[model samples]
Target: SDGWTCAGSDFDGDQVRGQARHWVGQQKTKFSEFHTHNDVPLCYFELGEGNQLTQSYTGFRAYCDEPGDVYNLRYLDVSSRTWVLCTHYDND
Candidate 1:
């Protein structure tokens, strides 16, 4: 029970010690406990006591640190023999 022992005022009548002991005379075991859900695509790490559980990369960025580091030319309609660009300077 409740992880406590009854002695004086915490004691109750019609009982030896107090309430029934669930894990009586059982030693505390140390083990690693990892939990995750199958539906949810995520993982966590048990960083011991008083530590925050870290997540396994929820999301990622396309360009690392570089925001507008992408450049590309669009294609437009063609009339005669002229250079055409998409969304840019079209051959009008």
Candidate 2:
């Protein structure tokens, strides 16, 4: 994951390594979520709500310092912690 690239971007181990489907901002999750799905631990899209959605999320499967750092997480409302699967729709 040190030198891997996706769609012209580096697919770091800590960030998502593929594309995203939606952007649901800051949702809460209680269970442990896998970084990869179907073979990729990375997901595309960030946490956002209606009319303010962004497109094309990347870096969720990466572990570098591009944009989507999975380790860089936040706990919402002291009840749950949301994960970072991608960038663009998320934030930097």
Candidate 3:
């Protein structure tokens, strides 16, 4: 399952907002949603075993560069809890 599945919602014209939900044993563990165009994050979070909020990251904007402009996802790492950039360049 790669522990992940992506889906979309909120249809608005040619652009559509999308979200990816991560699961473990049918219990939602994490998720991230973004604007399909530039891939700007609408929200991102990670939940614990009981769906308890373990980490959350909000507020993001699009980044432009050579390859393509992508979402700059700033997230709070579970362990460090510090702000980190989760960009399209990241390989997970």
Candidate 4:
């Protein structure tokens, strides 16, 4: 409810989300949910609820404040970064 801020610029959260969005390639409209793929297994939260699902994810303390408008994505690049809380209608 508090201390949560938008995953604004300077955060890789949106980047991962973007990659997954295009990869899935089927939402056609604003993204509504998280879809898991074998490629980015650990990249997407697959979390529909706001509570932390488990301790296996990144240590970013990432998760959305609400449902239906939240997203959790982390990419394992050279930096191994992640992002959460993308409240929007992104392409699935």
Candidate 1 wrongly placed segments (more than 4 Å): 1-38, 52-92
Alpha carbon RMSD to native, model 2? 13.7
For each candidate, what is the lDDT?
0.18, 0.30, 0.30, 0.33
Would you estimate the TM-scores of all the predictions?
Answer: 0.14, 0.22, 0.22, 0.21
RMSD of 3: 13.2
Model 3 per-residue lDDT at 1: 6
Candidate 2 has its poorest 10 consecutive residues by lDDT at: 15-24
TM accuracy, model 2 = 0.22
Error of 3 at 90 (Å): 10
Cα shift from native, residue 6, model 4 (Å): 18
Instruction: Report the C-alpha lDDT of model 2 over 1-92, residue by residue, as the tens digit.
Output: 33232333333332232221222123322223444333334323432222233343322232212133343222123233343333233324
Model 1, 1-92: lDDT tens digits are 21111111121111211111111113211121211232322211211111222222212101101122111111212343322221212122
Per-model clash counts, in order, read 2, 25, 0, 2
Off by over 4 Å in 2: 1-33, 54-77, 82-92
**Candidate 4 residues 36-79, lDDT tens each?**
33222222233212332332434333322222222343223335
Q: Name the TM-score of candidate 1.
A: 0.14
In candidate 3, what are the lDDT values of residues 1-92, reduced to their tens digit? Answer: 01211111111211211122222223332334443355543333342322232335332212222223223334445577554554332123
